[PDB]
């Protein structure tokens, strides 16, 4: 199969700016018939790909002046000229020069904003959680930018990874920050045998960690 590879994964952009996506390939895409079948799809949220550009440089129809493309053989690049409210999504490059036509990973065209470190909240496990056995512990790391953070769950001091199931939100349309939250699960008594539970967040905007906590 021919590997197609994209860079970046998220492309932070100022709307109204220049924006350039780049795509590259394992084998070459120039064909026996002197042709290049390098095409580009865009997948807007929870929806279906729509062909944007074909054979490196030709657009599809509808598609506007703002889109463009180039390159050869191993390396190709798309470019939007004034990126707009209507262009953000994943962006896939694929090749049809070979079999099997391979798809290429994608880069989302997200929005870039002045940063924010994550507002965090540890919450103890409840009456009923406890009355059923089992006690989930929850840390909401919230309204932050940018996407990469991560959450240690220090448990007395020694850390943990059974249980910790983490989940994340997409870019908050209203303010562009992110949010995320881990749920550590411990049985009602793996729970009732420790003091001190601490999720520890590490994110760019504090050289120090940002560690909420509570004692059992």
């Amino acid at each position: 199969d021919v590997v197609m590879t994209q860079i970046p994964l998220s492309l932070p952009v100022n709307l109204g700016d220049q924006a350039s996506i780049s795509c590259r390939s394992s084998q070459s895409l120039i064909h026996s018939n002197g042709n290049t079948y390098l095409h580009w799809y865009l997948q807007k949220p929870g929806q279906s790909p729509k062909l944007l550009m074909y054979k490196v440089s030709n657009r599809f129809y509808g598609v506007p002046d703002r889109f463009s493309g180039s390159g050869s053989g191993t390396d190709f690049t798309l470019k939007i000229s004034r990126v707009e409210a209507e262009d953000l999504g994943i962006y896939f490059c694929s090749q049809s020069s070979h079999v099997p036509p391979t798809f290429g990973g994608g880069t989302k065209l997200e929005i870039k904003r002045a940063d924010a470190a994550p507002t965090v909240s540890i919450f103890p496990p409840s009456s009923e959680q406890l009355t059923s056995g089992g006690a989930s512990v929850v840390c909401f790391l919230n309204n932050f930018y940018p996407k990469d953070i991560n959450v240690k769950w220090k448990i007395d001091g020694s850390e943990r990874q059974n249980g910790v199931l983490n989940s994340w939100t997409d870019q908050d349309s209203k303010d562009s920050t992110y949010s995320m939250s881990s749920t550590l699960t411990l049985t009602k008594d793996e729970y009732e045998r420790h003091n001190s539970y601490t999720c520890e967040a590490t994110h760019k905007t504090s050289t120090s960690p940002i560690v909420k906590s509570f004692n059992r």
């Binding site: 079948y37 279906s48 099997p100 798809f103 909240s121 919450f123 959680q129 909401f140 949010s179």
Partner: protein, 219 residues
């Protein structure tokens, strides 16, 4: 509109047979091929096979070959995928594309059919209330949430004060502790509103016909 239109989302326990239709209207079916493309949870938008209508012969990439069966009923314009004895890992969304013979692209795709393969039986959720280990005045906002846990199937709908609290709420995606799902939501309110005025998380899980209202009560 010239479009490929495909069937409903489905839910199958493993070892079963699901059959996906894809109907072409508005275009000369025989003149393009219908290529099936797969979207697995954050894996590759991977290509499956192709069914060329001037012949009715299928090509397969090697992976899905044979267990996956494309078919055709041209005087109906409809294309077919059957997956027999579906594994768990046969959970994705499947798309069909009008593929072209000239410049070799895929220009009309249909909405997708999600197949969920899981053994689970429907369970209503356990909505649990999350109120704060008495942090103070953390500045001027309080944050509480609900942990609606252990449900099958998706979806649930979470809201607070019957829809009256929306700026602030952040429901996070549903993930899978062991066959069932766990979901949670957060509402940040001004510190004079909680506990002065009540905050409730309302969750309804329709595929079980249950609504749970949980009032977030101090600790």
């Amino acid at each position: 509109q010239i479009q490929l239109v495909q069937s409903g989302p489905e839910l199958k326990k493993p070892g079963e047979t699901v059959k996906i239709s894809c109907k072409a209207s508005g275009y000369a079916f025989t003149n393009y091929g219908v290529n099936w493309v797969k979207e697995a949870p954050g894996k590759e938008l991977k290509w499956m096979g192709w069914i060329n209508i001037y012949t009715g012969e299928p090509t397969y990439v090697d992976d899905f070959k044979g267990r996956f069966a494309f078919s055709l009923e041209t005087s109906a314009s409809t294309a077919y995928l059957e997956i027999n004895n579906l594994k768990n890992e046969d959970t994705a969304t499947y798309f069909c594309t009008r593929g072209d013979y000239v410049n070799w692209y895929f220009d009309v795709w249909g909405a997708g059919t999600t197949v969920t393969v899981s053994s689970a039986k429907t369970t209503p959720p356990s909505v649990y209330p999350l109120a704060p280990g008495s942090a103070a005045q953390t500045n001027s906002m309080v944050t509480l949430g609900c942990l609606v846990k252990g449900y099958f199937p998706e979806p649930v709908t979470v809201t607070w004060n019957s829809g009256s609290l929306s700026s602030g709420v952040h429901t996070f995606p549903a993930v899978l502790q062991s066959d069932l799902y766990t979901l949670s939501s957060s509402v940040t309110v001004p510190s004079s509103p909680r506990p002065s005025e009540t905050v409730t998380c309302n969750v309804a899980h329709p595929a079980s016909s249950t609504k749970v209202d949980k009032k977030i009560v101090p600790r």
